[PDB]
C-alpha cells in the first residue's frame, strides 16, 4: 500500500517531546486534507525548540478530491509509524500522496537525488513508442507542480513537492523526466522518484 519509505538511522527517545510533537504533526496532516492538497507544518508552532521541534508536509496528487486526499494521507500516517517507528526523519510515498517529516526544515531545499526508478518490460510498434515519447516529454513542458499528459492508452504524471519554487520544480522534473525517457522511454511504463519530485508513465492497464 506504499511505494517507498525513507527512515533516518537516527532515532528520537521514547515518549520524548519529539515523538509527541510528531504524532500531533501527523494528526494535523489528516485534518488539513479537508482544506488543501498541500500544507507545511511546524510543531510546536512558534520559535523552534531544541531537539523536540518537528517539520513536515503532506502532498496529494494535484487533482485529488478532499475525500480521496484524506483517505490517502490517513493511510500514509497509519503505515509510516510501522515502517519508520522512532526515526527523526520519515518520508512515505504512496501512489496518490506523500507525507514527510524531519527535525529540521526542508522547505524550499532542492534535492534531485534518486530514490527509486523502475521500468516496465520493452514495448516495431512506432505508434506506441511515439506516444510514450510525446507523453513523457509533454510532462517537461507542462506548467506548475502537478502535470499530466495522455495520448491513447498512454498516461503520464509528474509532481513536485509543494515547497519547491517554480524554478526548482522545473529543474527537479527536467532531471526526473530525462531519466524516465532515457531509461524507460521504450518500456511499458516506468517511474522515477527523486527526493523532491517524480515523473511516471503507464501504457495500457
Ligand atoms: C536532528 O537529529 C539529529 C540526530 O539526533 C541531530 O544530529 C546529532 O546532533 C547531536 C548534538 O546536537 C550530536 O551529538 C550527534 O552526533 C548528531 N547525530 C547525527 C546522526 O548527526 C541534529 O542536530 C538534529 N537537528 C536538530 C535541528 O535538532
Ligand atoms: C508554509 O506554511 C506557512 C504558514 O502556513 C506559509 O506562510 C508558507 O507559505 C508555507 N511555505 C511553504 C514553502 O510551503
Ligand atoms: Na491526474
Numbering used by the authors: 30 to 152, 155 to 236
Task: Give the published text.
The Domain of Unknown Function 26 (DUF26; Gnk2 or stress-antifungal domain; PF01657)18,19 is an extracellular domain harboring a conserved cysteine motif (C-8X-C-2X-C) in its core. The third class of DUF26 domain-containing proteins is the PLASMODESMATA-LOCALIZED PROTEINS (PDLPs). PDLPs contain two DUF26 domains in their extracellular region and a transmembrane helix, but lack a kinase domain. We defined the structural relationship of tandem DUF26 domains by determining crystal structures of AtPDLP5 (residues 26–241) and AtPDLP8 (21–253) ectodomains to 1.25 and 1.95 Å resolution, respectively.
The PDLP5 DUF26-A domain is N-glycosylated at positions Asn69 and Asn132 in our crystals. The N-terminal DUF26-A (PDLP5 residues 30–132) and the C-terminal DUF26-B (residues 143–236) domains are connected by a structured loop (residues 133–142) and make extensive contacts with each other. The resulting ectodomain has a claw-like shape with the β-sheets of DUF26-A and B facing each other. To assess the functional roles of the invariant disulfide bridges in PDLPs, we mutated the partially solvent exposed PDLP5Cys101, PDLP5Cys148, and PDLP5Cys191 to alanine. While the wild-type PDLP5 ectodomain behaves as a monomer in solution, the mutant protein tends to aggregate in our biochemical preparations and display reduced structural stability in thermofluor assays. These experiments and crystallographic data suggest that the conserved disulfide bonds in PDLPs and potentially in other DUF26-containing proteins are involved in structural stabilization rather than redox signaling. Despite moderate sequence similarity, the overall fold of Gnk2 and PDLP5 DUF26-A and B as well as disulfide-bond arrangement is conserved. Notably, Glu130 and Arg132 implicated in mannose binding in Gnk2 are replaced by Asp131 and Lys133 in the DUF-A of PDLP5, respectively. Despite these structural homologies of Gnk2, PDLP5 DUF-A, and PDLP8 DUF-A, we could not detect binding of mannose to isolated PDLP5 ectodomain in vitro. We are also unable to detect any binding of other water-soluble cell wall-derived carbohydrates to the PDLP5 ectodomain.
